[PDB]
Design an enzyme around this catalytic site. Sequence first.
Site, PDB file in Angstrom:
ATOM      1  N   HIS A  66       0.834  -1.216   0.000  1.00 36.75           N
ATOM      2  CA  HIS A  66       0.000   0.000   0.000  1.00 36.75           C
ATOM      3  C   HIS A  66       0.861   1.256   0.000  1.00 36.75           C
ATOM      4  CE1 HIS A  66      -2.363  -3.186   2.140  1.00 36.75           C
ATOM      5  NE2 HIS A  66      -3.093  -2.934   1.069  1.00 36.75           N
ATOM      6  N   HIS A  70       5.353   6.766   6.888  1.00 42.19           N
ATOM      7  CA  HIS A  70       5.103   6.378   5.497  1.00 42.19           C
ATOM      8  C   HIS A  70       4.655   7.623   4.759  1.00 42.19           C
ATOM      9  CE1 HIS A  70       1.142   6.064   7.540  1.00 42.19           C
ATOM     10  NE2 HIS A  70       0.623   6.528   6.417  1.00 42.19           N
ATOM     11  N   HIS A  91       2.182   9.179   1.187  1.00 41.23           N
ATOM     12  CA  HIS A  91       1.084   8.957   0.264  1.00 41.23           C
ATOM     13  C   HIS A  91       1.525   9.899  -0.869  1.00 41.23           C
ATOM     14  CE1 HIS A  91      -1.577   7.051   3.329  1.00 41.23           C
ATOM     15  NE2 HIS A  91      -0.867   7.774   4.179  1.00 41.23           N
ATOM     16  N   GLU A 139      -3.259  13.644   1.149  1.00 37.52           N
ATOM     17  CA  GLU A 139      -4.565  13.175   1.595  1.00 37.52           C
ATOM     18  C   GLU A 139      -5.297  14.414   2.102  1.00 37.52           C
ATOM     19  OE1 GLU A 139      -3.627   9.510   4.158  1.00 37.52           O
ATOM     20  OE2 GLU A 139      -4.606   8.804   2.343  1.00 37.52           O
ATOM     21  N   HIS A 160       3.421  10.800   6.918  1.00 44.22           N
ATOM     22  CA  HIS A 160       2.715  10.521   8.155  1.00 44.22           C
ATOM     23  C   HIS A 160       3.645   9.849   9.154  1.00 44.22           C
ATOM     24  CE1 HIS A 160      -1.332  10.261   5.844  1.00 44.22           C
ATOM     25  NE2 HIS A 160      -1.019  11.537   6.142  1.00 44.22           N
ATOM     26  N   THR A 188      -6.334   6.661   7.697  1.00 42.49           N
ATOM     27  CA  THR A 188      -6.827   6.940   6.360  1.00 42.49           C
ATOM     28  C   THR A 188      -6.871   5.681   5.491  1.00 42.49           C
ATOM     29  OG1 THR A 188      -4.669   7.558   5.463  1.00 42.49           O
ATOM     30  CG2 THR A 188      -5.980   9.322   6.477  1.00 42.49           C
TER      31      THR A 188
HETATM   32  N1  LIG Z   1      -2.195   6.881   6.802  1.00 40.66           N
HETATM   33  S1  LIG Z   1      -2.356   6.844   8.366  1.00 40.66           S
HETATM   34  O1  LIG Z   1      -3.666   7.176   8.929  1.00 40.66           O
HETATM   35  O2  LIG Z   1      -1.312   7.576   9.172  1.00 40.66           O
HETATM   36  C1  LIG Z   1      -2.094   5.204   9.086  1.00 40.66           C
HETATM   37  C2  LIG Z   1      -1.314   4.955  10.236  1.00 40.66           C
HETATM   38  C3  LIG Z   1      -1.148   3.666  10.754  1.00 40.66           C
HETATM   39  C4  LIG Z   1      -1.755   2.599  10.141  1.00 40.66           C
HETATM   40  C5  LIG Z   1      -1.591   1.202  10.688  1.00 40.66           C
HETATM   41  O3  LIG Z   1      -0.913   1.042  11.670  1.00 40.66           O
HETATM   42  N2  LIG Z   1      -2.206   0.129  10.080  1.00 40.66           N
HETATM   43  C6  LIG Z   1      -2.157  -1.270  10.487  1.00 40.66           C
HETATM   44  C7  LIG Z   1      -3.212  -1.724  11.339  1.00 40.66           C
HETATM   45  C8  LIG Z   1      -3.599  -0.890  12.432  1.00 40.66           C
HETATM   46  C9  LIG Z   1      -4.640  -1.259  13.330  1.00 40.66           C
HETATM   47  C10 LIG Z   1      -5.306  -2.490  13.125  1.00 40.66           C
HETATM   48  C11 LIG Z   1      -4.949  -3.364  12.033  1.00 40.66           C
HETATM   49  C12 LIG Z   1      -3.883  -2.978  11.120  1.00 40.66           C
HETATM   50  F1  LIG Z   1      -3.535  -3.773  10.099  1.00 40.66           F
HETATM   51  C13 LIG Z   1      -2.536   2.815   8.997  1.00 40.66           C
HETATM   52  C14 LIG Z   1      -2.731   4.101   8.436  1.00 40.66           C
HETATM   53 ZN   LIG Z   2      -0.744   7.588   5.964  1.00 38.60          ZN
END
Ligand SMILES: NS(=O)(=O)c1ccc(C(=O)NCc2ccccc2F)cc1
Ligand SMILES: [Zn+2]
Length: 258
Positions: free
Chosen positions: A62, A92, A94, A104, A117, A196
Amino acid sequence: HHWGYGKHNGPEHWHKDFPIAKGERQSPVDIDTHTAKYDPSLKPLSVSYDQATSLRILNNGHAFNVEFDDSQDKAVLKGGPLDGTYRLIQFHFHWGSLDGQGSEHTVDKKKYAAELHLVHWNTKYGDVGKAVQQPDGLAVLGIFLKVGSAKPGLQKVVDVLDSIKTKGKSADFTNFDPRGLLPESLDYWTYPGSLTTPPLLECVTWIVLKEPISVSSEQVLKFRKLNFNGEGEPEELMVDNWRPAQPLKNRQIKASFK
Ligand SMILES: NS(=O)(=O)c1ccc(C(=O)NCc2ccccc2F)cc1
Ligand SMILES: [Zn+2]
Ligand SMILES: [Hg+2]
């Protein structure tokens, strides 16, 4: 099938498997600078990344994540609108297929070339797993990237992208200093939101910096050469991995400056 950013599994389809996508505090949002409220009681941000320990970088299909050792208070974020200490776990970006899109969050409907982010989690919860279940479990520092001059501190990240071109690949990434990615000023806007990307959990206190950082055209070009797909599968370039702005609803964007 599994979510993505393509025509058949993109943002507009996420609501089918993740109902929360149509919730009350979803991100990202458009920052209308004229309706944001200057809150003089907002404390300045405290960024303590001097003892930061990066471990590796990976392509999760992603985007690419640079992970840090969050076993103890090494790199933390405090102050601003936060109550407590949040540990940096990963960062990371975007980005888009063109320089006119990628972010975003938007500022007065303006989209930037990309968005960084820096993800942190509230230490009072013991682990990220518990934090994601709380309304103030996460704090994400958002930084806009605009095309212009080169960002020296970003180059080490750019150089290793070839090692993690496809989904599932990871490479050791030690001794990277995240301080090299910060703009000069720490003025910000803040609002309660969510992740997001699916699961789209509404457990995030968003802190978006007013000042973008500049990155060269060549640096962003390298982001665009990554693949959504794994090795041996048809090539799908990793571009436009961003979710469009969500309605603000009953929320207020506060600003730490006027
Ligand atoms: N673009 S952003 O908003 O900053 C963002 C920050 C962290 C995650 C994350 O940790 N995902 C994995 C995850 C988290 C919680 C539960 C299951 C998962 F696979 C995803 C998006
Ligand atoms: Zn992000
Ligand atoms: Hg939550």
